[PDB]
Amino acid sequence: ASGGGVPTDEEQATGLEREVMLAARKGQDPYNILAPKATSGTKEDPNLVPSITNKRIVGCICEEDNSTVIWFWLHKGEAQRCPSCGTHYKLVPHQLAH
Amino acid sequence: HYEEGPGKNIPFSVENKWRLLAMMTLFFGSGFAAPFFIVRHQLLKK
Amino acid sequence: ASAAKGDHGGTGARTWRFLTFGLALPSVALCTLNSWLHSGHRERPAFIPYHHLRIRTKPFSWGDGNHTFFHNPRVNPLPTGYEK
Amino acid sequence: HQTHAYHMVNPSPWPLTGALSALLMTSGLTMWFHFNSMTLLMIGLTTNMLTMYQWWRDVIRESTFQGHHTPAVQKGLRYGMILFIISEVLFFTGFFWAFYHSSLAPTPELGGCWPPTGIHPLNPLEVPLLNTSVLLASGVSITWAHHSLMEGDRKHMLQALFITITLGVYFTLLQASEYYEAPFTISDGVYGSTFFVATGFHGLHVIIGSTFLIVCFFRQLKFHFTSNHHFGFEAAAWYWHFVDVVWLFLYVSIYWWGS
Amino acid sequence: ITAKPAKTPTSPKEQAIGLSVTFLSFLLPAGWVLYHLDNYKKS
Amino acid sequence: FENRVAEKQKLFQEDNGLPVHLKGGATDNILYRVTMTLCLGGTLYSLYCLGWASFPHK
Amino acid sequence: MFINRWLFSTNHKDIGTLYLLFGAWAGMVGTALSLLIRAELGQPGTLLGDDQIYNVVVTAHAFVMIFFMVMPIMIGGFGNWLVPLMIGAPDMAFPRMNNMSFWLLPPSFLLLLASSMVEAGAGTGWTVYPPLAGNLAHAGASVDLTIFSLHLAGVSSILGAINFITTIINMKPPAMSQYQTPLFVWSVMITAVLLLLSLPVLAAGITMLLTDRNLNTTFFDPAGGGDPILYQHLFWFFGHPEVYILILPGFGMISHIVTYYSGKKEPFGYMGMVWAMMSIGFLGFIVWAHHMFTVGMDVDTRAYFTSATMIIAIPTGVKVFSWLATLHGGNIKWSPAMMWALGFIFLFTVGGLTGIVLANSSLDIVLHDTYYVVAHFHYVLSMGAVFAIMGGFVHWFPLFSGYTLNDTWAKIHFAIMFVGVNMTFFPQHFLGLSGMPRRYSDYPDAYTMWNTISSMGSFISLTAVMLMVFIIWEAFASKREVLTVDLTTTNLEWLNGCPPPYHTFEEPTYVNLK
Amino acid sequence: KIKNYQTAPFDSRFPNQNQTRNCWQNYLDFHRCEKAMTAKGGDVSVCEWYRRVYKSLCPISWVSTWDDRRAEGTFPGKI
Amino acid sequence: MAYPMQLGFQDATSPIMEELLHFHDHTLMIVFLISSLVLYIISLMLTTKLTHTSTMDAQEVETIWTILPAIILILIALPSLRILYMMDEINNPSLTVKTMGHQWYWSYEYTDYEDLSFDSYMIPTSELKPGELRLLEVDNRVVLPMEMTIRMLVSSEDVLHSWAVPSLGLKTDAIPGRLNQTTLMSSRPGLYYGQCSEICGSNHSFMPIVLELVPLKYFEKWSASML
Ligand SMILES: CCCCCCCCCCCCCCCCCC(=O)OCC(COC(=O)CCCCCCCCCCCCCCCCC)OC(=O)CCCCCCCCCCCCCCCCC
Ligand SMILES: CCCCCCCCCCCCCCCCCC(=O)OCC(COC(=O)CCCCCCCCCCCCCCCCC)OC(=O)CCCCCCCCCCCCCCCCC
Ligand code: HEA
Ligand code: HEA
Ligand SMILES: CCCCC/C=C\C/C=C/C/C=C/C/C=C\CCCC(=O)O[C@H](COC(=O)CCCCCCCCCCCCCCCCC)COP(=O)(O)OCCN
Ligand SMILES: CCCCCC/C=C\CCCCCCCCCC(=O)O[C@H](COC(=O)CCCCCCCCCCCCCCC)COP(=O)(O)OC[C@@H](O)CO
Ligand SMILES: CCCCCC/C=C\CCCCCCCCCC(=O)O[C@H](COC(=O)CCCCCCCCCCCCCCC)COP(=O)(O)OC[C@@H](O)CO
Ligand SMILES: CCCCCC/C=C\CCCCCCCCCC(=O)O[C@H](COC(=O)CCCCCCCCCCCCCCC)COP(=O)(O)OC[C@@H](O)CO
Ligand SMILES: CCCCCC/C=C\CCCCCCCCCC(=O)O[C@H](COC(=O)CCCCCCCCCCCCCCC)COP(=O)(O)OC[C@@H](O)CO
Numbered sequence A: 001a002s003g004g005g006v007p008t009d010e011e012q013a014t015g016l017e018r019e020v021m022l023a024a025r026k027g028q029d030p031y032n033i034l035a036p037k038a039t040s041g042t043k044e045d046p047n048l049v050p051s052i053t054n055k056r057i058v059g060c061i062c063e064e065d066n067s068t069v070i071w072f073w074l075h076k077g078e079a080q081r082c083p084s085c086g087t088h089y090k091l092v093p094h095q096l097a098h
Numbered sequence B: 001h002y003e004e005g006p007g008k009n010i011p012f013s014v015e016n017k018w019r020l021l022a023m024m025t026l027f028f029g030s031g032f033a034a035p036f037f038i039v040r041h042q043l044l045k046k
Numbered sequence C: 001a002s003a004a005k006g007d008h009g010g011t012g013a014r015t016w017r018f019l020t021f022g023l024a025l026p027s028v029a030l031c032t033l034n035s036w037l038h039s040g041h042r043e044r045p046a047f048i049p050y051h052h053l054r055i056r057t058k059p060f061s062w063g064d065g066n067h068t069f070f071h072n073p074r075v076n077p078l079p080t081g082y083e084k
Numbered sequence D: 001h002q003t004h005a006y007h008m009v010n011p012s013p014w015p016l017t018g019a020l021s022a023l024l025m026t027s028g029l030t031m032w033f034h035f036n037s038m039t040l041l042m043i044g045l046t047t048n049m050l051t052m053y054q055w056w057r058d059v060i061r062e063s064t065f066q067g068h069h070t071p072a073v074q075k076g077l078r079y080g081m082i083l084f085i086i087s088e089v090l091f092f093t094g095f096f097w098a099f100y101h102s103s104l105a106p107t108p109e110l111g112g113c114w115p116p117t118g119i120h121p122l123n124p125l126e127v128p129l130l131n132t133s134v135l136l137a138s139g140v141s142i143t144w145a146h147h148s149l150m151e152g153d154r155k156h157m158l159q160a161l162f163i164t165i166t167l168g169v170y171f172t173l174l175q176a177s178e179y180y181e182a183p184f185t186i187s188d189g190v191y192g193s194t195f196f197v198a199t200g201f202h203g204l205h206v207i208i209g210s211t212f213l214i215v216c217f218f219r220q221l222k223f224h225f226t227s228n229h230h231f232g233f234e235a236a237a238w239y240w241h242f243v244d245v246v247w248l249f250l251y252v253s254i255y256w257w258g259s
Numbered sequence E: 001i002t003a004k005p006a007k008t009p010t011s012p013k014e015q016a017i018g019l020s021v022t023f024l025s026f027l028l029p030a031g032w033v034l035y036h037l038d039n040y041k042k043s
Numbered sequence F: 001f002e003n004r005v006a007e008k009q010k011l012f013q014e015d016n017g018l019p020v021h022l023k024g025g026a027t028d029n030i031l032y033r034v035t036m037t038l039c040l041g042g043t044l045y046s047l048y049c050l051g052w053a054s055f056p057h058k
Numbered sequence G: 001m002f003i004n005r006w007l008f009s010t011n012h013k014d015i016g017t018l019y020l021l022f023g024a025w026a027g028m029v030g031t032a033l034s035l036l037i038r039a040e041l042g043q044p045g046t047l048l049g050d051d052q053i054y055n056v057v058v059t060a061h062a063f064v065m066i067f068f069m070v071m072p073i074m075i076g077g078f079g080n081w082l083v084p085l086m087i088g089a090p091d092m093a094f095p096r097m098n099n100m101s102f103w104l105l106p107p108s109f110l111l112l113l114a115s116s117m118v119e120a121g122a123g124t125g126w127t128v129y130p131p132l133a134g135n136l137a138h139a140g141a142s143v144d145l146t147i148f149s150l151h152l153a154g155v156s157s158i159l160g161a162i163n164f165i166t167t168i169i170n171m172k173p174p175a176m177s178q179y180q181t182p183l184f185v186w187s188v189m190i191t192a193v194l195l196l197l198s199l200p201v202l203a204a205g206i207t208m209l210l211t212d213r214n215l216n217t218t219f220f221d222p223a224g225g226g227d228p229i230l231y232q233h234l235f236w237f238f239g240h241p242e243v244y245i246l247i248l249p250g251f252g253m254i255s256h257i258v259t260y261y262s263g264k265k266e267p268f269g270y271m272g273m274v275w276a277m278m279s280i281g282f283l284g285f286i287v288w289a290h291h292m293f294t295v296g297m298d299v300d301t302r303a304y305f306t307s308a309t310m311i312i313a314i315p316t317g318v319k320v321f322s323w324l325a326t327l328h329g330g331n332i333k334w335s336p337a338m339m340w341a342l343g344f345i346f347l348f349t350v351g352g353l354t355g356i357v358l359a360n361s362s363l364d365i366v367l368h369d370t371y372y373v374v375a376h377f378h379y380v381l382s383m384g385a386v387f388a389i390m391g392g393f394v395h396w397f398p399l400f401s402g403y404t405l406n407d408t409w410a411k412i413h414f415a416i417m418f419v420g421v422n423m424t425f426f427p428q429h430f431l432g433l434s435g436m437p438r439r440y441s442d443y444p445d446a447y448t449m450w451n452t453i454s455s456m457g458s459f460i461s462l463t464a465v466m467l468m469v470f471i472i473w474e475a476f477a478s479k480r481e482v483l484t485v486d487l488t489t490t491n492l493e494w495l496n497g498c499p500p501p502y503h504t505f506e507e508p509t510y511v512n513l514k
Numbered sequence H: 001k002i003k004n005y006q007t008a009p010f011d012s013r014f015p016n017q018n019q020t021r022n023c024w025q026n027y028l029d030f031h032r033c034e035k036a037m038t039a040k041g042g043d044v045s046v047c048e049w050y051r052r053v054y055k056s057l058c059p060i061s062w063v064s065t066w067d068d069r070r071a072e073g074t075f076p077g078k079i
Numbered sequence I: 001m002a003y004p005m006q007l008g009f010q011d012a013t014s015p016i017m018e019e020l021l022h023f024h025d026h027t028l029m030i031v032f033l034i035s036s037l038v039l040y041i042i043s044l045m046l047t048t049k050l051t052h053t054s055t056m057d058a059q060e061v062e063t064i065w066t067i068l069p070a071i072i073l074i075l076i077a078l079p080s081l082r083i084l085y086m087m088d089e090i091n092n093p094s095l096t097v098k099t100m101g102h103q104w105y106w107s108y109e110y111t112d113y114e115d116l117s118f119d120s121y122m123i124p125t126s127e128l129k130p131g132e133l134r135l136l137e138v139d140n141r142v143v144l145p146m147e148m149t150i151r152m153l154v155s156s157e158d159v160l161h162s163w164a165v166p167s168l169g170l171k172t173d174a175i176p177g178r179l180n181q182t183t184l185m186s187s188r189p190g191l192y193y194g195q196c197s198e199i200c201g202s203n204h205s206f207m208p209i210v211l212e213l214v215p216l217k218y219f220e221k222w223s224a225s226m227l
């Protein structure tokens, strides 16, 4: 038998490792470990881009297997379009503060 | 925190262009002079 | 192979402790006996000052410059031969 | 506040102290080989040991104590350790190349034969075979230690890891004794050169790997490792298997085929 | 690329000084050694 | 032995602005100062040794 | 704060800056050494002394240009600054180990300077072949100091290599495949794999040289059954990969510069460019004995190394043709950077083709250890590697500094350099075909004209170097602050401004999977 | 045939640029032949060809070093 | 030897060196063509206001870019490897001569019949006879019969050297403990010069090679006179 005596992550993980472990349990991704899935990206159904400030860099892979990524600052306000494919992105600011 | 922006993200000052000229002179000039002074050193031994 | 037992699908740790105590340490215990049997001091061979052996191109940086780091007087001749 | 999982490291003096350690050790070897003095070298070795101690202490502080080792940081350390081991494989490869070059085309100065005239190789069935059994046994015990850790078994992890360390120490003492008893030396031409430098570098790596395992032993005593998070133990196991495989290549190449 | 006008303009005269001092920092030490090679030879 | 990791986690997460290499207390500062003194003094000695080895003697 | 920032750095940008500063200083040492070479050769007779002082200068020249100028600028400097910015990463994987890679170099350089000041120096060639490099023909500390210099530089680049490979594999946005990373990032990754595999074999060889010199081993000493030629195999197993290490990050920068100043969103044939760099990296490991065609190797070995060497032309040509196809249809901006890149494409091609001449073991009997080889490698290094560096530097100076260069001054600098390097090296082909040996302080009288012209070329190059320092001073003296940069949609490194903040990508980019 | 001897002919055992082993083998063959003939009272003259071939191919300092080591009892090849 | 302002190879003295001059002419034509085509295409890409900045399909052109260079490499490899295997083909030498490298002079041994050896040193500049060549003349030349297959064996008694004669297409490294073989055949009498071609220390630049190629009967009497 195991007489035990080894801590688990549940008991002893701390700091950012613990925050990543507990968010994953609730299916949340505050530390951007997963690729977000696209919407249809129309003006009616824009890609929703979380940020902790009023702007965030978007990279748009316009078509699957494009080697060229298209990069642009997405500002709080009206949806913006990728300058190459026109896909719509909208910033959704929050804070992580708690 | 650390200084940001042009002239501040470097380990040398660019606050005064004449002091900067002196520093760059000593920096690049020391590099270029060193082989001449090692040739001298070796000729002056034997 | 020269192996032949059969996959022991128990606890991982349990199986590897089984191999540690049942195969690995017994092999070490056996090789330890084979070595504390064949380990009697053997007769040192006649010294021949072969020029491809006892190389000295620079003195060693310890001792008198002429003794190797793990010099064994019984079996390691100097370039001029055995000590006594 | 970052919203990625990666580790921004506090500004550290240990890269500079490590770089200067390398200057003192190299200029020290130079002073030892040419100017009959060990003083620079001893300072270098001392600052090197202090650098490694404080650097790896801080990595334990960052991980066990501060929680900076997210799965993403851990996956990076996995790559780093694999790439490090690959660079060590290629290092050993140069010594194997030297051995095969010298031994497959023995020159007239040797007698045009391998082993050279005047060389009496060790019996590969004596201490070299014991050394093989010792490092192979240590690969079994460390696998036991690994499985005990993952299964949450403190006492069997500690027993298996202790046994692994003990076999490492035993190999080290057997090899020191073989060095003392060997009737050939490093100055015995290309036979002594290839034998002592290849097995000598292997021996240093056994001492390094044994040291890494002892660090894991004391970290385990102090409950640092969880049943799921123990990269230092995994890195030390990979390094230990590396040391075992290099031994098997040395045993087959130098002790057996080159005898 | 677009940029602001210079914060601390460097006049033609100031450029002549920077260029002159830069070239002399390379030329004078090497010049000195090379001029005295013959003197170094005897020693 | 007993698991005292939670105590160490509390010490090394204390909001005191110290870098990790000094956050253990006064002993860190001492070991730092000894390491840097040996490195900087050793480096000065290595430069002296160069100067000495750069000129003939006997 | 100064010490914490600049001695205790864990920041990819500052460490990049330290690398560029180190490489610039090293460049000046290398340049001075090159001028001492061409002063010795600039008229028939003896200027400095016999071949010992001369070959100490030649040996140092090579080590400084390769280990202290090119690799630190390209990999340490551009690599650290650009690679994390181009993949949206907040820093390197091992930011503290990164700082040790940097701080190993000043001590490495100190050991090489000590080498040259002790005894009569290491007059070995940068190849350090025994027995000339052994303890009877090179008694004393010099060669051991050289070996230790190389051990420090080796450890630096191996740790830097682990850092880059790990960073590039592990720290991209989760949607970004390796087939969505920029060509410069590919060039650094492939370069790092070559360093990881080649430098340990160099370390093994030079360690065996050290033991032969100091512990009475005989790996390279026939008296003990050793072989000088074994050293050559171990050295060149590293030394051919080393020349691909020196150019690959240049190929990465040229891909970015040609794309940028062609006004294109992307290089022509991305996947062909990735394929070509991997193929070159692989082929660079199986060709090393083209450095050994005169040692006495069997004819079938010579036939194999001839054929395997030439094949490298195919992936290299795909890159050259793909650069031309990138220009094709561009709105060309004739920037200083673009002029460096266009000079690169042509002069690298000439240098590559003289390499192909040398690949032919039968001609190489006559061209080996002559100035034809010297012409080949200065075309690819002093024109290829250096032009990619100057192009990179001019292009990215405003990103690193936040200040603009004077473009007119930059174009003047290019024109002077272009004249000097061509006048220096082109006539070295004639010296090689007509049989002037390498590593000579003096030459038979017939070789005078081409040596004279070559030496005059080198003084023109000196004028360009001195002017470069002034141009850098003028930019920092004037402080024209950058406002707007074109094509940020396809050059992510520019999107955080100039210079970027100390911390970038604290919040990572958003990139979705469609 | 030793009347007509110009130099050592091509030997398909040593077809390549490195001839070290050619010189060594003919040196060994000559001294083995010669040992065997004087030990069976017979005539050394039959060993002559190996003598001519090693003299042609072997550097004088190699022959002279090997001759010294045979007299010293430190020659490493089997004769 | 090389003459002032020379651009190309020394005139061939041996059938092998002639083969190399023709192979070099062929390879040089390809080098000039590729380098001038690349320079021309650069100028063509940069001399139009016409633009095409949208994505370009690469599949078709990459076929051309790999197959044409592959064929060109084959067109170089074919004659290259012919000459390589031609150089290696069995001759029957009439004579064997050894050269040993030293710091800093060559020694020669002609030991097919008699014990003939000598040292060959550079003539110092202050001792040249009028019209003699600075750094090239030796005291004792390497006298050899013309129009005959000679086996040269090269080694060293110290560090690496390399024994070269450009007009005969010869360069053979001199390695201590090793005996390298090359074959020499001069179509012509004369004086054929070369220089040490592996860095070997203080006087690397100052240990040249002079072959003196003469009719067999002059070679035979010279040999007898040198005993
Ligand atoms: C507060 C306590 C401080 C005490 C300790 C430190 C003293 C600090 C002073 C006082 C501190 C208070 C604040 C003062 C700010 C700076 C003062 C200044 O203008 O003083 C100048 C400073 C800084 O020094 C340097 O930076 C050296 C370069 C000098 C300027 C050249 C400009 C080059 C521009 C062109 C390059 C383009 C590429 C960049 C383009 C990228 C742009 C972003 O001096 C030093 O104190 C040098 C200390 C070393 C730090 C690391 C430098 C990296 C070494 C480079 C490798 C050399 C290879 C030799 C190899 C060795 C072989 C032997
Ligand atoms: C600034 C540099 C210094 C200037 C030096 C210029 C040279 C002027 C000298 C007096 C000139 C008179 C004759 C002109 C021919 C000169 C060049 C040439 O044909 O070279 C001659 C050969 C050897 O060939 C020979 O065997 C001699 C051929 C002569 C035949 C013509 C009729 C005979 C009269 C010539 C006199 C000798 C005849 C006797 C000899 C008989 C046989 C040996 O040398 C080589 O192999 C060099 C290999 C270099 C490889 C680089 C590849 C090309 C890059 C640039 C291409 C694009 C252009 C932009 C170019 C951009 C730059 C890269
Ligand atoms: C950046 C450094 C660098 C690079 C990239 C190269 C690239 C090449 N090198 Fe070079 N080389 C050196 C640096 C470099 N070299 C150094 C420093 C030495 C000397 C070491 C010493 O002794 O100190 C040397 C020595 C050297 C030798 C030894 C010669 C001797 O000592 O006798 C040889 C022999 O094969 C060689 C060949 C080549 C070849 C075939 C390439 C190829 O990679 C080139 C391929 C490129 C092209 C061909 C041009 C572009 C292609 C096209 C436009 C397609 C069409 C072309 C064809 C169909 C041919 N090199
Ligand atoms: C990168 C490698 C490199 C570079 C750039 C050079 C550049 C030069 N080299 Fe050299 N050279 C070698 C590597 C290089 N060399 C090697 C490996 C050997 C063989 C060594 C051996 O035989 O053992 C050699 C040999 C060699 C010889 C033969 C010596 C002999 O055989 O006796 C000669 C002779 O003319 C020569 C000359 C020159 C000259 C005049 C330059 C000039 O073109 C230099 C001009 C100046 C520069 C190109 C500027 C450099 C500075 C920067 C680029 C930094 C600034 C950057 C920023 C601010 C970011 N070199
Ligand atoms: C089980 C082993 C125990 C631990 C080792 C013990 C002592 C120090 C050894 C260090 C390990 C290094 C290995 C390679 C170096 C040299 C050979 C060492 C192997 C050894 O210890 O061999 C001994 C020789 O030691 C000698 O020369 C003396 C050697 C001491 C001098 C130090 C050598 C300095 C070499 C510098 C290494 C630089 C490489 C760095 C690579 C960095 C990567 C870039 C053998 O003894 P012997 O009397 O000849 O023969 C036996 C006869 N009874
Ligand atoms: C492109 C390469 C593909 C093929 C690789 C194959 C590898 C090994 C082949 C060896 C097989 C030959 C063995 C029997 C015959 C004897 C060989 C021999 O003799 O080879 C000798 C030594 O080779 C030696 O050590 C050989 C040493 C090996 C050098 C290979 C380098 C690779 C090292 C890196 C590999 C990393 C892998 C990581 C490990 C997991 C050298 O030749 P000589 O005798 O000096 O000849 C001289 C003349 O007299 C001939 O006339
Ligand atoms: C002559 C003098 C020579 C030198 C003498 C001896 C030198 C070295 C002794 C051996 C090395 C000891 C290394 C100790 C490392 C301790 C830190 C550690 O292991 O750190 C771990 C990360 O791994 C990491 O950095 C992994 C770090 C990997 C370290 C690699 C070790 C190899 C070093 C060998 C040196 C090369 C020399 C080669 C000679 C040619 C921490 O993460 P975890 O373990 O997941 O903990 C977290 C959990 O608690 C959370 O719940
Ligand atoms: C033998 C030697 C031969 C001499 C050759 C001289 C070499 C170089 C000539 C330099 C001429 C610069 C080229 C054109 C202008 C660029 C740089 C410049 O001198 O100043 C320009 C404007 O002057 C402004 O207003 C700023 C006003 C401040 C004036 C200070 C500058 C002095 C003028 C330059 C003359 C230098 C001569 C010195 C000779 C030693 C700045 O750059 P822009 O024009 O804004 O272009 C970039 C834009 O896209 C940015 O938005
Ligand atoms: C002859 C004498 C020559 C002397 C030269 C010696 C040079 C220097 C001596 C000083 C070195 C000792 C100091 C310890 C260094 C430990 C490095 C390490 O362990 O680095 C780790 C990365 O490399 C990894 O994992 C894995 C990589 C582990 C590397 C360990 C150190 C190896 C040093 C020698 C390298 C030999 C190369 C192999 C072939 C010869 C950790 O990365 P950091 O960026 O710190 O932290 C990141 C944080 O997230 C951690 O919380």
Ligand SMILES: CCCCCCCCCCO[C@@H]1O[C@H](CO)[C@@H](O[C@H]2O[C@H](CO)[C@@H](O)[C@H](O)[C@H]2O)[C@H](O)[C@H]1O
Residues within 6 Å of the ligand: C007, C008, C009, C010, C011, C012, C013, C015, D136, D137, D139, D140, D143, D244
């Ligand atoms: C050099 C000396 C030899 C040392 C060899 C070290 C090999 C290290 C590879 C580890 O591979 C092992 O394969 C075992 C297969 O035997 C498995 O064990 C266990 O896994 C199962 C469940 O986890 C148990 O039920 C099984 O009984 C048990 O074998 C286990 O996946 C794994 O560790």
Ligand SMILES: CCCCCCCCCCO[C@@H]1O[C@H](CO)[C@@H](O[C@H]2O[C@H](CO)[C@@H](O)[C@H](O)[C@H]2O)[C@H](O)[C@H]1O
Residues within 6 Å of the ligand: E026, E027, E028, E029, E030, E031, E032, E034, E035, G035, G462
């Ligand atoms: C490799 C690139 C470098 C080569 C090109 C450099 C040209 C250098 C410019 C001149 O440098 C100076 O030249 C003076 C002579 O013109 C020297 O003075 C010397 O000559 C004068 C007149 O003879 C005396 O007044 C001085 O005292 C005496 O030191 C002086 O020392 C030296 O600094």
Ligand SMILES: CCCCCCCCCCO[C@@H]1O[C@H](CO)[C@@H](O[C@H]2O[C@H](CO)[C@@H](O)[C@H](O)[C@H]2O)[C@H](O)[C@H]1O
Residues within 6 Å of the ligand: D035, D036, D037, D038, D039, D043, F037, F038, F040, F041, F042, F045
């Ligand atoms: C901050 C700490 C870092 C700075 C430490 C600086 C220490 C400087 C100590 C003095 O230096 C030398 O150390 C060696 C000590 O053993 C001696 O070598 C010696 O080597 C041989 C004896 O082993 C003698 O014959 C030589 O004469 C002798 O120089 C030498 O004399 C002694 O002066």
Ligand SMILES: C[C@H](CCC(=O)O)[C@H]1CC[C@H]2[C@@H]3[C@H](O)C[C@@H]4C[C@H](O)CC[C@]4(C)[C@H]3C[C@H](O)[C@]12C
Residues within 6 Å of the ligand: A005, D154, D155, D158, D159, D162, F001, F002
């Ligand atoms: C003290 C501790 C029990 C309490 C706890 O787990 O902290 C036990 C568990 C495992 C034990 C160790 C293991 O049994 C392995 C070793 C066995 C040797 O006989 C003594 C030392 C040895 C290294 C032991 C020391 C000590 O008794 C340990 C460390």
Ligand code: CUA
Residues within 6 Å of the ligand: I101, I102, I104, I160, I161, I162, I196, I197, I198, I199, I200, I201, I203, I204, I205, I207
């Ligand atoms: Cu002998 Cu160069």
Ligand SMILES: [Cu+2]
Residues within 6 Å of the ligand: G239, G240, G243, G287, G288, G290, G291
């Ligand atoms: Cu190569």
Ligand SMILES: [Mg+2]
Residues within 6 Å of the ligand: G294, G368, G369, I162, I197, I198
């Ligand atoms: Mg050579």
Ligand code: NA
Residues within 6 Å of the ligand: G040, G041, G042, G043, G044, G045, G046, G047, G441, G442, G443
């Ligand atoms: Na000269």
Ligand SMILES: [O-]
Residues within 6 Å of the ligand: G240, G243, G355
């Ligand atoms: O090359």
Ligand SMILES: [Zn+2]
Residues within 6 Å of the ligand: A060, A061, A062, A070, A082, A083, A084, A085, A086, A087
């Ligand atoms: Zn898009």
